[PDB]
Amino acid sequence: PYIGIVADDLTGSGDTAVQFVRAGWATQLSVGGAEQALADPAVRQAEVLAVTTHSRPLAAADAAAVVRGEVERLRAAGVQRLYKKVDSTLRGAFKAEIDAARLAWGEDAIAVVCPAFPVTGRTVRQGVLYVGDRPVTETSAATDPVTPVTESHIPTLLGCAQLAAQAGETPAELARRIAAAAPVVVVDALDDADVQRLARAIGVLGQRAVPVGSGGLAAPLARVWAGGQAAGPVLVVVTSQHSAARQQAAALQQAGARTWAPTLAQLADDRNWAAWTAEVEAAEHGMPAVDALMLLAPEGRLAGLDADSVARRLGELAARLVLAHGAAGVVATGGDGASAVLAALQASGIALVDEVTGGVPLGTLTGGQAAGLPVVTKAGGFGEQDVLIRAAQAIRERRFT
């Protein structure tokens, strides 16, 4: 395994494990500990191994003992990223397990603690686990029949430090504050936005980080740790004249896509186009790496230049950039644009994996010269304004194997 998930109960391990699957990680679940699964010859197949320590009701020391043994076994087996999955509402021998997982993971391990789960009403604000508007201790969790919660201020509960993201901060900036708060630190999160930030920061901290969280942090970390794979840029081709498409294009380019957008006269004959394309190719060869690269057909009509030729010209240029430089994936809109890109790459179809949203499928190319390249296709007029951003992003945040 590359990733190990150590949950304190069965529901938790299963829930978190499946979030890793939906992001494309080949995932194995043990209904107990890791030894039996790690014995089986087909463990090499599993990129993620999810286990439960059955420890939520245990006394501190018993809990720490099991957690220690499982992290030790995951560690010995070559695991490189560890997620400790806990209750969003803190139930369990919360402190003891955290200390045991920390120490077992390594000498410079950081426990980065944030059990928030915004979509279910749990947040961390100034260290405090809030359910809706109340500290967890004012909720039913205080009278859990098995494991009462008796402290809502996680920094008090752990005897550690606390951080709230300064400013409209960067993942890079947060990571650095987190690192200085080693070995244990609570990080606030108020909405899914703060949670995505924190995941990204954890991503930057790399092997040393031990995220301790609930379902909230799972999917975000699965995507971050999938972001690790990269093959160069996502090429986005936009041939459509539909207003929705033009706005979606504007939105992507504003987000930072490097954009080549030829005039009508430039697409008009082979002579202008050959010269114009050689410059695109030569420049992109030498320019800095960018996450998204867009090719954009111009608005309007020029006599004797038909829509299909525009599409072909742009698809052939896409195919040239994919083949000569490499790419993480291709996004194409509208239909004629998608057709032209598949044609120029000699692909026969798309092997579907999932979608960005209904009607915006995500798969990989079948046949031809870039078989296996992740691909997203979309009708020209379909989708909300942000869909091309979301499409490029969806390719980067999925594990493909």
Side-chain angles (χ1 to χ4, degrees), residues 299-300 302-316:
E299 304 168 37
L302 175 58
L305 169 62
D306 65 32
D308 294 7
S309 301
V310 170
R312 179 180 69 77
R313 299 281 170 93
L314 295 177
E316 293 179 354

Side-chain angles (χ1 to χ4, degrees), residues 48-130:
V48 181
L49 178 55
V51 302
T52 170
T53 47
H54 205 174
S55 50
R56 192 169 288 184
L58 296 176
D62 289 320
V66 55
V67 165
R68 161 169 62 88
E70 294 297 309
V71 173
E72 283 177 353
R73 296 215 244 247
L74 290 169
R75 188 180 195 191
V79 178
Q80 284 187 94
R81 285 305 179 281
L82 175 73
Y83 182 65
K84 183 176 207 291
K85 158 70 177 64
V86 297
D87 184 36
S88 62
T89 45
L90 312 190
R91 287 167 293 174
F94 195 84
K95 180 183 170 56
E97 292 197 15
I98 275 162
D99 287 340
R102 283 207 285 132
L103 262 138
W105 184 236
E107 247 208 339
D108 37 41
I110 317 291
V112 192
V113 177
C114 178
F117 201 163
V119 77
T120 70
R122 291 85 173 120
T123 56
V124 182
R125 180 168 42 99
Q126 294 290 276
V128 174
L129 195 300
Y130 286 92

Side-chain angles (χ1 to χ4, degrees), residues 315-332:
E316 293 179 354
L317 169 62
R320 188 201 309 198
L321 291 181
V322 169
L323 293 179
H325 293 353
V330 177
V331 183

Side-chain angles (χ1 to χ4, degrees), residues 283-300 302-376:
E284 284 291 338
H285 185 56
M287 288 169 162
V290 74
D291 276 4
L293 188 55
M294 181 168 60
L295 312 178
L296 176 60
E299 304 168 37
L302 175 58
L305 169 62
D306 65 32
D308 294 7
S309 301
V310 170
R312 179 180 69 77
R313 299 281 170 93
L314 295 177
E316 293 179 354
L317 169 62
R320 188 201 309 198
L321 291 181
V322 169
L323 293 179
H325 293 353
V330 177
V331 183
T333 194
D336 298 349
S339 280
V341 170
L342 274 68
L345 287 162
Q346 291 180 242
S348 76
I350 303 169
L352 282 200
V353 162
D354 201 68
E355 65 189 17
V356 176
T357 284
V360 192
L362 170 43
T364 51
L365 290 188
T366 300
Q369 307 291 298
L373 189 66
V375 56
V376 170

Side-chain angles (χ1 to χ4, degrees), residues 129-172 174-224:
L129 195 300
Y130 286 92
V131 185
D133 296 324
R134 289 178 305 172
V136 51
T137 48
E138 295 182 12
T139 76
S140 56
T143 57
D144 188 87
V146 182
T147 69
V149 176
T150 54
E151 178 60 56
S152 297
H153 188 239
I154 300 173
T156 285
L157 183 52
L158 300 180
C160 70
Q162 179 273 1
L163 292 176
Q166 296 171 353
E169 200 168 4
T170 63
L174 187 48
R176 294 189 40 183
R177 294 227 312 298
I178 282 168
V184 179
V185 63
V186 170
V187 173
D188 287 3
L190 302 184
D191 47 24
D192 282 326
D194 297 348
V195 167
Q196 190 186 240
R197 193 193 279 99
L198 174 56
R200 291 194 195 206
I202 292 304
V204 163
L205 296 164
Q207 166 165 325
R208 205 156 75 99
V210 182
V212 179
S214 64
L217 210 33
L221 274 179
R223 280 169 226 128
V224 168

